[PDB]
Design a protein around this ligand. Structure first.
Ligand SMILES: O=C(/C=C/c1ccc(O)c(Br)c1)c1ccc(O)cc1O
Length: 275
């Protein structure tokens, strides 16, 4: 699939940089014809077949095709796609309130503050999983707020760069996600499905309530070894006033066997969440 090949700078002006990764940079932008503001994600293309730099066209097209399907209050919306010889440029909904990660560093959350965020995450993941879309990269960095100066900020899931459609209940690919948040089946190079996202939500919930990462080691290999062995515990120093039911929710997500892990529907019916 080909994208718009006119120069993006003829239709948008860019501003503040919003974020920067190995193969992409995101810049605030403004559409000249409407004054409306967006986030432009510039993805570096691969320059040869065998190269390891840049993102393969297959991977870029997969992300675009997923973004084109989704429309939900808790997921980013895609506006337009441009390309040139160097980059594919996704014009995405602007989410300007900052990361859940950075907002976390400002303060641990109470269970009410945590569940208010978590319920929005669960609602977005429920929508995705309903469409058989696995995100495969859920982590505080990919959860951003629309406005961080309200008592109950609204969140959006960003970054569909690892997301896959799961038409057969599992996909057999490598997911090089972030060690602290990937499920044991990713660490072990196993077939992957929607369950991997539910493990990541369990990790996110642990961090939201405690300020601490449950599997984090001193090196990436230690973190990955801890994930595979399900080597975590609730430290009393961090969890002593956290309810048992919040711990129960986490414990039913941080389950090695994906078949025994809570699904997204289970998580919404769990007594800690269900109203
Ligand atoms: O920084 C990133 C996310 C940014 C963002 C900020 C505000 C937004 O509205 C939107 Br959409 C995205 C990022 C994304 C992908 C990647 O491969 C590397 C990255 O660093």
């Amino acid at each position: 699939t080909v994208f718009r090949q006119e120069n993006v700078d003829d239709y948008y002006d860019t501003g503040e940089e919003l974020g920067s990764g190995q193969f992409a940079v995101v810049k605030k932008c403004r559409e000249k014809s409407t004054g409306l503001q967006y986030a432009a994600k510039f993805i570096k293309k691969r320059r040869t077949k065998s190269s390891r730099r840049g993102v393969s066209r297959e991977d870029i097209e997969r992300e675009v095709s997923i973004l084109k399907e989704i429309q939900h209050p808790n997921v980013i919306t895609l506006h337009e796609v441009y390309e040139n010889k160097t980059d594919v440029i996704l014009i995405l909904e602007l989410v300007a309130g900052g990361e859940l990660f950075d907002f976390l560093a400002e303060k641990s959350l109470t269970e009410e503050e945590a569940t208010e965020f978590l319920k929005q995450i669960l609602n977005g993941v429920y929508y995705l999983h309903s469409l058989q879309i696995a995100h495969f990269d859920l982590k505080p960095e990919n959860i951003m707020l629309l406005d961080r100066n309200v008592p109950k900020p609204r969140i959006k899931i960003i970054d569909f760069g690892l997301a896959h459609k799961i038409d057969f209940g599992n996909e057999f690919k490598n997911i090089f996600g972030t060690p602290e948040f990937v499920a044991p089946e990713i660490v072990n190079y196993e077939p992957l499905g929607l369950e991997a996202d539910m493990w990541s939500i369990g990790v996110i919930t642990y961090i939201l309530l405690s300020g601490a990462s449950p599997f984090l080691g001193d090196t990436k290999q230690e973190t990955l070894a801890n994930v595979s062995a399900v080597n975590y515990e609730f430290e009393d120093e961090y969890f002593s006033n956290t309810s048992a039911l919040a711990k129960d929710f986490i414990r039913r997500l941080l389950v090695k066997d994906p078949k025994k892990r809570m699904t997204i529907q289970d998580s919404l019916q769990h007594p800690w969440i269900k109203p």
